[PDB]
């Protein structure tokens, strides 16, 4: 699995802040927009993009405050990410798109799709954000960790001071052993502790046990939209997973309209790091059927 990031930097001014993005492939079709989550960047798509780039334009932004994008003084609430991603999409003059989304990137993607349904021609997704009614519906072995994350004193000591989301949570979400070189790519944006705000706010925005109520409502709304939409859907899943267990993936494949599910093999949260070639090749094949 490739550790390099052989992509020229592209930058666009978005609400007065510079955002970085990968942009490769031809301008003669429908672009494919790749959205990463927490605590990753466009680096997470590095081995998937090469399967798609020969036939379709691949656009992979770094969320505001992450990757090579600027780091404004924000709270980095989901509202901030929604605002900046909305403006990113408009700054690139995108019309219709295909979405490839993961983790907090899936919340952005589904929320954008709900509000712009005529402009989404397909959604590939994996390990995505859905409402978590109670802490019993959160993964058993990550309950104590994320409960600790969702506090001001303990959570910030862990995530901001000790950088545990990068040093611990990230590699623990990959079944195979992430290499030092790969870890260093993921570490790059957060070498300064003050820049780790998004890493702590994100888990505090997760819709768990009815809080934060506004996120729970937003996520419920786009899940309702997804269940009602005829848009082509491609769901990647792994065993045992984290956000999406195998049993949930099978249920979603039946319940969501026009949905194909693909087993990547062993996987936790960062499925892209465990089977990029299958994810890439299947997206490429799926795109040709659209
Ligand atoms: Cl998170």
From Swiss-Prot:
Pathway the protein acts in: Xenobiotic degradation; haloalkane degradation
EC number(s) recorded for this UniProt protein: 3.8.1.5
GO cellular component: membrane
Induction: By 1-haloalkanes.
Keywords in alphabetical order: Detoxification, Hydrolase, Plasmid
Gene3D superfamilies: alpha/beta hydrolase (3.40.50.1820)
Transmembrane segments: none
Cited Pfam families: Abhydrolase_1 (PF00561)
Claim: Lipid metabolism is one of the keywords in the record: no
InterPro entries in the record: AB_hydrolase_1 (IPR000073), AB_hydrolase_fold (IPR029058), AB_hydrolase_sf (IPR050266), Epox_hydrolase-like (IPR000639), Haloalkane_dehalogenase_2 (IPR023594)
Entry keyword annotation includes Hydrolase: yes
Domain AB hydrolase-1: 31-155
Active site: 103, 127, 269
GO terms for MF: haloalkane dehalogenase activity
Chemical reaction(s) catalysed: 1-haloalkane + H2O = a halide anion + a primary alcohol + H(+)
Any single GO BP term: response to toxic substance
Protein origin, superkingdom: Bacteria
NCBIfam families in the record: PRK03592.1
Family to which this protein belongs: Belongs to the haloalkane dehalogenase family. Type 2 subfamily.
Record's function text: Catalyzes hydrolytic cleavage of carbon-halogen bonds in halogenated aliphatic compounds, leading to the formation of the corresponding primary alcohols, halide ions and protons. Expresses halogenase activity against 1-chloroalkanes of chain length C3 to C10, and also shows a very weak activity with 1,2-dichloroethane.
Oligomer and partners: Monomer.
Protein name: Haloalkane dehalogenase
Species of the source: Rhodococcus rhodochrous
């Amino acid at each position: 699995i490739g550790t390099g990031f052989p992509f020229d930097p592209h930058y666009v001014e978005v609400l007065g802040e510079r955002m970085h993005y990968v942009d490769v492939g031809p301008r003669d079709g429908t672009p494919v927009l790749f959205l990463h989550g927490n605590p990753t960047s466009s680096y997470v798509w590095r081995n998937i993009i090469p399967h798609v780039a020969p036939t379709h334009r691949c656009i992979a932004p770094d969320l505001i405050g992450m990757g090579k994008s600027d780091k404004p003084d924000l709270g980095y609430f989901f509202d901030d990410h929604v605002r900046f991603m909305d403006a990113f999409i408009e700054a690139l003059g995108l019309e219709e798109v295909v979405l490839v989304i993961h983790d907090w990137g899936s919340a952005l993607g589904f929320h954008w799709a709900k509000r712009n349904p005529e402009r989404v021609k397909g959604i590939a997704f994996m390990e995505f954000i859905r409402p978590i009614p109670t802490w019993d519906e959160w993964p058993e072995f990550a309950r104590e960790t994320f409960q600790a994350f969702r506090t001001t004193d303990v959570g910030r000591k862990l995530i901001i001071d000790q950088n545990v989301f990068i040093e611990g949570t990230l590699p623990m979400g990959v079944v195979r052993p992430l290499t030092e070189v790969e870890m260093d790519h993921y570490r790059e944006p957060f070498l300064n502790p003050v820049d780790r705000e998004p890493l702590w706010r994100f888990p505090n925005e997760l819709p768990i046990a009815g809080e934060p109520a506004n996120i729970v409502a937003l996520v419920e709304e786009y899940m309702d939209w997804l269940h009602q939409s005829p848009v082509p859907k491609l769901l990647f899943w792994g065993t045992p997973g984290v956000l999406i267990p195998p049993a949930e993936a099978a249920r979603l494949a039946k319940s969501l309209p026009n949905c194909k599910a693909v087993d990547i093999g062993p996987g936790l949260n960062l499925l892209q790091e465990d089977n990029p070639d299958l994810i890439g090749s299947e997206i490429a094949r799926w795109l040709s059927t659209l």
